[PDB]
């Protein structure tokens, strides 16, 4: 029972691990980081 549960959980988590790998590669590629910068700059202008 423990072996079956562990194997099933590992297969379930393989997809999430690959998704995290893809997100990490996208972040390292410097693709989507400036949106937060623009939002915070707009917020700073509004606060000023």
């Amino acid at each position: 029972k423990a072996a079956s549960g562990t194997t099933g959980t590992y297969q379930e988590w393989k997809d999430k691990a690959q998704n995290l790998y893809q997100e990490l590669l996208t972040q390292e590629g410097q693709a989507s980081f400036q949106g937060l910068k623009d939002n915070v700059f707009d917020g700073l202008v509004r606060v000023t």
Partner: protein
Amino acid sequence: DFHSEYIVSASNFTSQLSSQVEQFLHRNIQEYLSILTDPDGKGKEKIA
């Protein structure tokens, strides 16, 4: 004459063993590929 008996010989080593090291450097380039490649899928086979 004795000096000659080494001079060219030294060049041989200067062109041989060091040269092999450069080849090993290319192997390091292959290691860099592991940085740009995330292994996945094989873990499921190994755990099964």
